[PDB]
């Protein structure tokens with residue numbers, strides 16, 4: 167069976183270094199809010215070329231912190247892509263604000279910036295751009311509209327660690343970037359973890375306070391806070407893995423290159439980034455009309471696949487109130503997408519096998 | 529320097545077992561939602577004598593999950609002790625509900641059940657009882673009022689793992705129990721972690737869903753959820769430490785016994801539990817009129833102390849709107865309390881040293 171994502175094999179490359187990093191935390195007797203978090207924040211900010219980074223508990227919490235720290239009026243709207251993973255939208259709902267869905271461009275699977283303005287109202291306060299599947303959103307028209315309406319740009323970078331647009335890294339393309347370090351991400355922990363990136367020192371400080379019960383000074387609570395911290399053990403593992411992130415992303419890109427050049431099936435639509443540095447290939451997403459039949463065929467041929475995603479947020483029981491809204495581009499994507507195996511440790515001869523098996527489906 | 533709480537020394541007792549447990553998780557390649565969480569939940573439910581336990585990210589999240597899962601009307605009130613750690617109150621605020629503060633009994637530092645009814649309204653939906661410092665709340669009058677008004681009882685058990693009232697463990701004294709496993713707690717992880725305990729299978733299932741983005745079935749979201757999980761590494765460490773929790777609590781109780789029998793200073797008020805099994809001695813809290821002078825004297829004598837707590841929630845900037853409300857019993861406690869060193873690994877001869885140093889303060 168070709169595995170979709172072999173996390174044991176990804177992390178086995180660092181077995182001795184992970185052991186030493188965990189043992190350093192255990193021997194420090196400091197498990198939270200410590201030197202490994204400080205070093206990881208400094209190094210991840212440097213990687214994104216932001217002045218600041220603040221660790222937190224997971225990627226949804228990163229988004230919740232970014233929105234909550236703005237303290238927008240309770241009737242505020244936040245624009246968000248209709249086809250993202252449900253967590254990008256949950257963050258807005260969980261802050262008590264109104265998500266306003268905008269279709270992706272079918273060509274990019276990312277928010278269509280030329281559809282946003284039609285949904286801006288006097289209540290709009292922010293845009294959550296999602297760099298979906300590893301592709302950076304083309305930001306030029308988002309920058310224009312954000313400034314025209316004095317909106318904040320909140321990047322959901324959970325799937326796109328290291329992606330580039332106009333020479334800037336995701337996490338440095340708006341007011342604040344929000345990251346997941348869930349174990350399956352392009353930079354994965356061995357547990358839940360997240361961070362924000364920003365150049366705004368006052369927002370970095372406010373988020374660091376809110377994520378620690380609202381406290382920067384022992385015994386004192388400035389804000390009504392949350393509890394959203396990155397464990398020292400996980401910061402230590404992330405800091406050692408960060409050194410290899412560009413190389414891992416390049417390894418992914420070489421699998422994507424095999425698929426993009428060797429799949430020749432007119433009934434399968436391949437991902438096509440606008441620039442190679444814009445895509446770090448968290449997910450390699452194809453579209454086909456017979457998606458469930460293709461997944462079963464591939465399974466019979468020894469190839470594990472997952473769907474990102476089969477049910478869009480507005481069709482979930484969670485968003486029952488939206489189930490009769492029409493987002494036909496999003497609906498089509500969710501009926502047609504399948505994710506092919508891709509990772510930094512995947513053998514290239516498996517990608518050639520998969521490409522020819524896909525060509526035999528036609 | 530006698531340390532307040534030596535976590536390295538607490539965890540050093542389990543050095544080889546923690547190494548083996550972490551390595552089992554790493555070699556499984558399953559870091560979340562796995563066998564260590566299943567085993568820990570089963571064993572912690574058995575320990576509390578509840579049918580169910582659901583792991584989550586931390587103790588505040590445990591409380592947030594318990595309240596959120598009830599889906600109370602948005603104008604609802606929740607009764608909570610005025611003198612608890614601020615997180616018990618943050619959980620209510622963060623769910624968009626109205627905290628209604630009730631004074632503790634000065635004799636117990638726990639909610640005065642004979643002051644609750646005066647603050648019940650038609651909007652009251654629950655009581656958050658807090659087993660503060662390790663002492664179980666006397667529940668008989670809380671049970672009576674909860675049933676009279678059809679209120680839910682949500683136990684904040686963060687400080688009281690293993691405490692007993694009327695032969696039942698904290699976490700089995702209401703509708704749902706909420707636990708912290710923050711590293712300093714009587715059962716501590718090596719990172720953030722938490723759980724709920726309950727006999728209600730439908731609430732356990734709903735909380736497990738909400739804590740995993742609202743999803744029990746892959747690709748499907750029943751509820752608008754959060755991301756609040758217990759890492760497999762932390763569940764593994766908690767499960768091995770749970771075997772020693774009663775023995776660690778008894779070791780704490782023996783330090784408390786030294787303080788309670790050997791401090792003879794009429795200007796210092798000692799903690800006095802109603803039954804020995806009701807107190808697991810997370811914190812050993814004294815009161816004195818010259819609290820800041822006593823803390824500095826003890827520091828000069830080589831004894832580290834902390835304050836639980838010096839600023840009550842209603843006086844915090846976080847709750848600025850409450851800063852002119854009067855809770856004189858809570859205010860007095862916060863001006864007078866100091867916590868003496870106590871832990872399962874503290875040397876008993878240090879407790880005798882501390883007791884005689886306190887007697888020399890008079």
Ligand SMILES: Cc1ncc(COP(=O)(O)O)c(/C=N/[C@@H]2[C@@H](O)[C@@H](OP(=O)(O)OP(=O)(O)OC[C@H]3O[C@@H](n4cc(C)c(=O)[nH]c4=O)C[C@@H]3O)O[C@H](C)[C@H]2O)c1O
Pocket residue numbers: 170171172173174224225226227250251253254296322324325345346347348349350359360472474557558559560755
């Ligand atoms: C745009 C966007 N925004 C915010 C978020 C929220 O970030 P978070 O709060 O940090 O999760 C996400 C998360 N997004 C991801 C989402 O895309 C989805 O990802 P998925 O690929 O379907 O997830 P997975 O199935 O758990 O992992 C994939 C492979 O990995 C293997 N695996 C996994 C684990 C955990 C393991 O322990 N061992 C394994 O071997 C099993 C699978 O084959 O579901 C996850 C729970 C979310 O974190 C997002 O995409």
Ligand SMILES: Cc1ncc(COP(=O)(O)O)c(/C=N/[C@@H]2[C@@H](O)[C@@H](OP(=O)(O)OP(=O)(O)OC[C@H]3O[C@@H](n4cc(C)c(=O)[nH]c4=O)C[C@@H]3O)O[C@H](C)[C@H]2O)c1O
Pocket residue numbers: 195196197198393532533534535536586587588589612613615616658684686687707708709710711712721722834836
């Ligand atoms: C009633 C109630 N409800 C809900 C909650 C919320 O639970 P949570 O969300 O899980 O935190 C609490 C938490 N309550 C505690 C609260 O009592 C307070 O506890 P504290 O004793 O003042 O905390 P501490 O100073 O961090 O730890 C004490 C000693 O431990 C040493 N230490 C600590 C750490 C973390 C370390 O890594 N290494 C060390 O050596 C240093 C100190 O000397 O602050 C904590 C952050 C909360 O988690 C509560 O009391």
Ligand SMILES: [Cl-]
Pocket residue numbers: 267268269281
């Ligand atoms: Cl649209």
Ligand SMILES: [Cl-]
Pocket residue numbers: 629630631643
């Ligand atoms: Cl009162």
Ligand SMILES: [Mg+2]
Pocket residue numbers: 223357358395397585719720757759
């Ligand atoms: Mg965590």
